[PDB]
Amino acid sequence: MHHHHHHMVDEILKLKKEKGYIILAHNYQIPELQDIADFVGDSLQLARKAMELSEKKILFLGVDFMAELVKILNPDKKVIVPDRSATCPMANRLTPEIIREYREKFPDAPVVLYVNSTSECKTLADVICTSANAVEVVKKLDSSVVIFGPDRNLGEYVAEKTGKKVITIPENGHCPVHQFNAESIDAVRKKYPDAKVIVHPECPKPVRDKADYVGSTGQMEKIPERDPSRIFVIGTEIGMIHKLKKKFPDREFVPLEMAVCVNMKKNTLENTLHALQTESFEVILPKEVIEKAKKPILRMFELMG
Ligand code: SF4
Ligand SMILES: [Zn+2]
């Protein structure tokens, strides 16, 4: 890397060791930040890993609902973030008011909230799910009808796999990063006839349908353990390409299209250094939010394994 960035990385690691921080980074952080992190993964993987740590201070590198997820499950640890504006546009479009409107219209349908959702919305969820476990969570629920949000694509995917009725909220709730074009897959089928295409379930239906595999980032990681393909084309955010290439240096990983989450890219070497220097910004939740949000997480845990 550029020599100046090297010096920033060195000072970041000096400060985190000095001040007793563990650094957690999401799969979609820039490579330089994945590289300095102690652990890199999806939101739940990170929140759970943190629960095993003896350190009491976490520098979280991702977006707000994820840092808050870490805080909800590690409420006695100090969690900081470099940029308080780093957020999830898809998650923020669902509001507690919208959930309320739907609970009343469909009083016998459990509210299943994807982990990509604001902490406030989680207080009103019956159960949380991840993109990896959503299908099995919904299958295990006794109701044949669920309210599901905030992603319409994941909801629709769940409906296909479970055969249950899924009422997705809010209307056209989606992730823009995962809105790949189906013709991009057609182009890879011609270019790389032996490559396997793996996409996220937040992708739209004709993208999912043309893929060899549909899975969460955690699932993408595991696929090349068993699949012997030399080339994987990956339908998710570009940060995952770095993660995959590091894990499987013997294969190639091609992004299906260049997809960048602007909010994820808000964290930089500069503001990560500043966060360790100043130990800001702390993630602080009202007690009511930590307790209420935690219940549908715990319920997910109960249903799932
Ligand atoms: S990638 Fe899509 S889902 Fe993940 S944070 Fe960015 S917008 Fe939200
Ligand atoms: Zn260099």
Which listed CATH number (3.30.559.10, 3.40.50.10800, 1.10.3210.10, 3.90.1570.30) goes with 89-174? 3.40.50.10800
Residue 68 φ/ψ region, left for φ over 0, alpha for ψ in the -120 to 50 degree band, beta for the rest = alpha
Q: Residue-wise over 64-96: b if at least 16 C-beta within 10 A, else e?
A: bbbbbbbbbbbeebbbbbbbeebbbebbebbbe
Does 89 appear as a known binding residue? Answer: no
Give 267 Cα–ligand 2 centroid separation in angstroms.
Answer: 20
CA 87 – CA 266 distance, rounded (Å):
9
Which residue, judged by its Cα, is nearest atom 5 of ligand 1?
88
Cross-strand pairs, 281: none
Q: Which residue has the tokens 């595999």?
A: 213
Question: Where do you find CATH 3.40.50.10800 in the chain?
Answer: 1-82+266-286, 89-174, 175-258
Give 2 Cα–ligand 2 centroid separation in angstroms.
Answer: 5
Angle (nearest 5°) at CA 73 between 242 and 31: 15
Does 88 appear as a known binding residue? Answer: yes
Q: Which of 109, 108, 110, 128 is nearest to 118 (CA)?
A: 128
Identify the nearest ligand to the CA of 8 by its number.
Answer: 2
Q: Which two tokens stand for residue 117?
A: 């959702």
Longest dimension (CA), the chain: 60
Does 162 appear as a known binding residue? Answer: no
What are the Cα distances from residue 25, in Å, to 8, 96, 127, 211? Answer: 17, 28, 25, 27
Dihedral angle, C-alpha 121, 123, 128, 130, nearest 10 °: 50
In this structure, the residues whose C-beta lies within 6 A of any atom of ligand 1 are 63, 88-91, 116, 175, 177, 237, 261, 263-264
Ligand 1 site-directed mutation target among 90, 240, 260, 264, most atoms within 8 Å of CB: 90
Q: Decide yes or no: CATH 2.60.40.1120 for domain 1-82+266-286.
A: no
Q: Could you tell me if 118 and 65 are in contact, meaning their C-beta atoms sit under 8 angstroms apart?
A: yes
Q: What is the number of the ligand 1 atom nearest to the C-alpha of 264?
A: 6
The DSSP string of 62-100 is S-HHHHHHHHHHSTTSEEE-S-TT---HHHHT--HHHHH
Q: Which method was it determined by?
A: X-ray
Q: Residue-wise over 40-58: b if at least 16 C-beta within 10 A, else e?
A: bbbbbbbbbbbeeeeeebb
Does 43 appear as a known binding residue? Answer: yes
Q: Which residue has the tokens 């939101």?
A: 43
Q: What is the number of the ligand 1 atom nearest to the C-alpha of 263?
A: 6
Which residue, judged by its Cα, is nearest atom 3 of ligand 1?
175
Q: Which two tokens stand for residue 76?
A: 């006695």
Q: What is the number of the ligand 1 atom nearest to the C-alpha of 177?
A: 2
* Percentages of the chain per state (helix, strand, coil), in multiples of 5: 50, 15, 35
Domain 175-258 fold: Rossmann fold (3.40.50)
Compute and round to an integer the Cα radius of gyration of the chain.
19
